[PDB]
Design a protein around this nucleic acid. Structure first.
Lengths: 237, 226, 54, 109, 133, 121, 230
RNA sequence: GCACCGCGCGCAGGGGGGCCGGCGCGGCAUCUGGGAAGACUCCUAAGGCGCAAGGGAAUACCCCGUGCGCCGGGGGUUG
């Protein structure tokens, strides 16, 4: 049975031994990366008993730090159907496709990636999903897509760079709204490979506070990944 | 210790390898006739100085140190002339340096042989060593992979035609190479040539007699005619 | 100093703390200072300090 | 060796699937605050069986799969060591039955 | 105070708080030629037609925020007015892009997001054929 | 170039080659590009070392793709001939891949070595 | 000109020390009418912290702080002139990683990390520049590394033996400096001073002077006199 | 609450402190111990090792002299 989760636009599938996460499919009858999907219909179709209306793509936590955070107990994702999100680190168009599903047709996703093969995946996913636009450009140079990207509400960030706080800072100063949202994933292995990861995450959140965010909360993804943090914070409020 | 040392062919200087490893090995140079310390040359490695050799006119010396580095360090300016690397030798063990008619600025020794611990013996041409600048990755005139275990002893002929190199840890590891053709002699040693475990080799001054001494403690002699 | 963190058991509630170094200078790290001091005096021992005193 | 390799590949895929399903079934999180008053407000807001059976079951299945994968890995390593001991030359690796470790410094020419 | 705002379609000018004028453009590959022309800072017919006034420089002010474009349109001598770079023109350019919903019935009472999308896909495929396959 | 996790420090190269020689004596090693590929695909490879002096680099550039997909560390040492006579082959190997086991001093050395590789990254 | 008058005292708070002090001086810029504008000199300092602090000399206080994720900084130096508007601070720290900061238009932000040494116990205790692109760092594992700034590579690794005076088998290169003619002077922990020729990065002289360890050096401007304090 | 002719006692916790003593984590020039360890070194012996069979057994462990191989010791004149 599918139930809505506390966050808007995300759903759970409950069974006798399982609890999966899923999102409403914008493109009906099609998947992307070899993902399971459930078929369901709203009640009122007893004499037929066919699952024809809603299709739900399954959201695996072991391939997305966002799914990891949502299961870890993130209290909000700052995005709803209707919002505008900027995605930094469109790693081959998986979580980007799911946040396109989350924001729905009136919501818009703008993906950013610098890798060319993940760029191929992102463009060939954006062929189908039209609420998302791709940018194959290094995220440290936001004035190469300042023309393309309008003002957004939530910045999501998963990039493997040491100056991740500076990338998020420049993209927030050029695109993020007042009182905006930021969901960032920290990879202590890429920032500092010797220090204790608690110390690394403390240094990163202090860098964001100096960068004039407001850190709401921090939760780590360690039933799912290793030494990865998820920081939820607000911009200027 | 004063174990390993070499005297210059000019006989004026004698070099002693210090026992101070710490990732970099030095060797002191001593004037012989007064037996007095005159200089100190230091190379960077991983365990120190594997081996070394004076130059033929006796002005500089070439030090092959482990982690494959080789430094040519002269006496006149008393600092390092140059540094190159043996092609992929995971660690030097012994070196030798002989011949005539080479680079006159690098001492005029034409051929340099470096034997690593993998058994591989590279033979470089010291005119090809020059790009005073030294090429950082010179190509060997020939790489020898005949012997299987770690190269123990290497000696050139005083006439610069023969090159004898031998490994000890196997029974009878010894080969003989003509120069400048760089071809291994295939009709000697045979399967029944009583070398043993070749511990030291020596060519005579006129290059007529090859002397081989094994780990049992016996010395044997071969005339070397052409 | 800074207030310690209250734990209800699953999460940790803590007050962020940046009121120490407004514009004067950052605080010196005592561990790094002692480390450099030890590299200075690796194995040496001080001479007797002063004159006649217990 | 080929047969043990195939069985190990199968067991590795199954162990990956089972660890994934077991994690999916079942100072970590930190909430920052600007002041002690807001933290106390947050504490004021805070003050104001079947899953166990299925979790123990999946845990036992994971433990069995781990033991099977370890056994196949030790078998594959043992067969590689048998190849090394029976190679066409003096080849290092593996202990003798007396305990001394086979170690040859010859290069495979 | 002439400002120079660059969206996927066109430009606007807010010299006299409130907007003064605009320049719209729709649905061409000349849009991506304009995109490359501003990714360098080169000549542009839309840019030149915007900066073309007939009297004189009444005040030598054109506020832009990328100094490459600034120090290119200085070298453009057709009107010989000068830009300034963005001396933290963050409040200005950020606030007008956020508050561009008031700009919408002023020039284009519509949504040009589809042209924006087409420009994005054109640019991205241009780069993925720059790294060809 | 495309050899971005490059190992240039000679002490680091010496440590890596000493570890490779030791693992080769323990037969905990896979030599060559194709056996490296197979070991990484089957997921047993604890660490993987490539050679930068391959004349077409594309014949080894595929290994970092699966290495990123499987989250295993890879590092470029300079000389394929050095890697070869460190393995004990007398042929120029271009990609070696050394695995892990239950317990060994070489397992502890592999943990320290991949810590140093993460430092290099 | 021989007066030596102490102008200004800026004190720091409790439990704050100062290790390094580096002025940066811009070249002599020329006005439109031929008048001369000398460089605008700024003051940077480290405090056994992970931070570099830029002090405002006019305000008689600190101006900015800068902090990258690394170890606590122990030594640092400014890249000298060849370019003109683009000069960078290079800082060696405890964990080894050569961090690299930028200073443009009065800004102080952590640009990047050049390298880090393989061993974690390698501690960087001195730094001095040979030329515009070559940095010489002195390292507590008896090491003097010559790195190159542009590609961030490792040109060479000069080394020194053990100290044979006492135990503590590592020597420590407490200071380095660079002569005008390319050679590098290096004060170490044996109380020696090592002259390294820099066309090949090798040692060319060892001079035993002090009994305990050398702590600082100074060069003549032309490169004739060496001052060694230990 | 006990005593209204009292200190003190059981109990809830709010805050800070002696940072007194233990625990955890980090580094640590050295020192100690173990492993690995240079191939001149040890490599157990003039013989040993491996694989597949065969017999015997304290029956988990082990021992012994057939067929294949892999080394080693001695001896060993340009086969």
């Amino acid at each position: 049975i599918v139930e809505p989760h506390r966050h808007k636009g995300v759903f759970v599938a409950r069974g006798g031994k399982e609890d999966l996460l899923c999102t409403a499919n914008l493109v009906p009858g099609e998947s992307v990366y070899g993902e399971k999907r459930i078929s369901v219909e709203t009640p009122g179709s007893g004499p037929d008993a066919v699952a024809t209306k809603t299709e739900y793509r399954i959201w695996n936590p072991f391939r997305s730090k966002l799914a990891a955070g949502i299961l870890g107990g993130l209290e909000t994702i700052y995005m709803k159907p209707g919002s505008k999100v900027l995605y930094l680190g469109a790693a081959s168009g998986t979580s980007v496709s799911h946040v396109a599903d989350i924001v729905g047709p009136t919501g818009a996703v703008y993906a950013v990636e610098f890798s060319h093969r993940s760029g191929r995946d992102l463009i060939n996913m954006a062929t189908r999903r039209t609420n998302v636009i791709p940018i194959v450009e290094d995220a440290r140079k936001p004035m190469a897509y300042r023309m393309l990207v309008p003002m957004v509400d939530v910045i999501f960030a998963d990039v493997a760079q040491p100056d991740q706080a500076r990338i998020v800072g420049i993209n927030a100063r050029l695109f993020l709204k007042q009182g905006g949202g930021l969901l960032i994933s920290i990879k202590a292995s890429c920032i500092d490979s010797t220090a204790p990861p608690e110390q690394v995450f403390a240094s990163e959140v202090q860098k964001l506070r100096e960068d004039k965010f407001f850190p709401k909360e921090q939760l780590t993804l360690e039933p799912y990944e290793r030494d990865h943090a998820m920081v939820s914070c607000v911009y200027l409020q | 210790t004063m174990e390993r040392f070499r005297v210059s062919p000019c006989g004026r200087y004698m070099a002693l390898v210090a026992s101070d490893k710490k990732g970099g090995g030095m060797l002191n140079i001593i004037n012989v006739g007064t037996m007095q310390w005159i200089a100190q040359a230091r190379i960077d490695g991983r365990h120190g100085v594997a081996d070394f050799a004076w130059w033929s006119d006796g002005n500089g010396l070439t030090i092959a140190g482990r982690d494959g580095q080789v430094t040519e360090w002269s006496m006149i300016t008393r600092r390092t002339v140059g540094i190159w690397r043996d092609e992929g030798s995971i660690g030097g063990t012994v070196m030798a340096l002989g011949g005539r008619n080479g680079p006159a600025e690098l001492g005029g020794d034409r051929w340099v042989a470096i034997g690593s611990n993998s058994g591989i013996l590279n033979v470089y041409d010291r005119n090809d060593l020059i790009e005073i600048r030294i090429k950082k990755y010179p190509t060997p005139t020939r790489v020898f992979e005949q012997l299987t275990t770690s190269i123990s002893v290497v000696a050139f002929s005083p006439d610069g035609q023969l090159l004898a190199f031998g490994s000890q840890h196997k029974k009878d590891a010894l080969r003989l190479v003509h120069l400048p053709s760089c071809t291994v002699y295939r009709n000697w040693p045979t399967e029944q040539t009583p070398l043993g475990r070749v511990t030291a080799i020596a060519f005579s001054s006129k290059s007529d007699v090859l002397a081989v001494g094994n780990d049992v403690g016996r010395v044997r002699l071969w005339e070397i005619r052409g | 100093k800074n207030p310690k963190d209250k734990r209800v058991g699953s999460t940790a509630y803590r007050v962020v703390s940046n009121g120490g170094d407004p514009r004067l200078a950052p605080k010196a790290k005592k561990q790094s200072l002692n480390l450099k001091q030890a590299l200075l005096r690796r194995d040496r021992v001080a001479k007797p300090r002063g004159g006649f005193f217990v | 060796l080929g047969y043990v390799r195939t069985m190990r590949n199968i067991a590795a895929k199954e162990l990956k699937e089972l660890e994934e399903r077991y994690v999916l079934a079942g100072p970590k999180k930190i909430v920052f605050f600007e002041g002690v008053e807001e933290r106390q407000q947050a504490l004021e807001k805070q003050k104001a069986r079947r899953k166990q059976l299925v979790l123990e079951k999946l845990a036992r299945k994971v433990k069995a799969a781990r033991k099977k994968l370890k056994a196949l890995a030790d078998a594959e390593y043992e067969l590689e060591l048998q190849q090394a001991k029976m190679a066409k030359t003096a080849t290092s690796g593996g202990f003798t039955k007396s305990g001394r470790r086979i170690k040859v410094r010859e290069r495979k020419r | 105070l002439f400002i120079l705002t660059e969206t996927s379609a066109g430009y606007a000018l807010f010299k006299a708080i409130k907007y003064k004028e605009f320049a719209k453009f729709d649905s061409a590959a000349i849009a991506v030629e304009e995109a490359s022309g501003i990714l360098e800072g080169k000549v542009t017919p839309k840019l030149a037609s915007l900066l073309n006034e007939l009297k004189d420089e009444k005040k030598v002010t054109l506020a832009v925020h990328d100094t490459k474009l600034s120090n290119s349109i200085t070298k453009l001598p057709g009107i010989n007015i000068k830009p300034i770079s963005g001396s933290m023109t963050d409040d200005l350019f950020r606030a007008i892009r956020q508050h561009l919903y008031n700009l919408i019935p002023g020039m284009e009472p519509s949504n040009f997001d589809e042209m924006n999308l087409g420009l994005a896909h054109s640019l991205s495929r241009h780069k993925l054929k720059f790294s060809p396959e | 170039s495309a050899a971005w996790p490059k190992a240039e420090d000679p002490a680091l190269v010496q440590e890596l080659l000493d570890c490779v020689q030791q693992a080769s004596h323990y037969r905990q090693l896979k030599k060559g590009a194709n056996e490296t590929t197979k070991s990484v695909n089957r997921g047993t490879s604890e660490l993987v070392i490539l050679a930068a002096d391959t004349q077409p680099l594309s014949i080894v550039l595929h290994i970092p793709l699966i290495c990123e997909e499987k989250n295993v560390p890879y590092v470029y040492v300079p000389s394929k001939v050095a890697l070869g006579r460190a393995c004990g082959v007398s042929r120029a190997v271009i990609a070696v891949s050394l695995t892990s086991n239950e317990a060994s001093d070489l397992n502890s050395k592999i943990r320290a070595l991949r810590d140093k590789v993460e430092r290099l990254a | 000109n021989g007066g030596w008058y102490q102008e200004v005292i800026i004190p720091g708070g409790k439990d704050r020390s100062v290790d390094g002090l580096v002025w940066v001086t811009d070249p002599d810029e020329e006005m439109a009418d031929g008048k001369i504008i000398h460089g605008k000199s700024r003051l940077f300092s480290i405090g056994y912290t992970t931070t570099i602090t830029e002090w405002d000399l006019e305000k008689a206080r600190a101006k900015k702080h800068a902090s990258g994720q690394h170890g606590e900084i122990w030594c640092f130096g400014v890249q000298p002139l060849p370019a003109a508007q683009n000069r960078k601070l290079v800082a060696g720290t405890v964990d080894g990683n050569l961090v690299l900061y930028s200073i443009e238009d009065g800004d102080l932000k952590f640009q990047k990390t050049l390298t880090r040494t393989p061993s974690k116990k390698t501690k960087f205790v001195s730094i001095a520049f040979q030329s515009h692109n070559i940095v010489i760092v002195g390292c507590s594992n008896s090491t003097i590394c010559a790195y190159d700034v542009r590609t961030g590579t490792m040109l060479r690794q000069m080394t020194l033996g053990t100290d044979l005076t006492g135990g503590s088998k590592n020597i420590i290169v407490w200071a380095v400096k660079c002569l005008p003619n390319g050679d590098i002077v290096s004060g170490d922990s044996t109380g020696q001073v090592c002259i390294w020729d820099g066309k090949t990065y090798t040692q060319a002289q060892r001079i035993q002077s002090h009994t305990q360890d050398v702590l600082c050096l100074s060069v003549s401007a032309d490169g004739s006199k060496i001052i060694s304090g230990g």
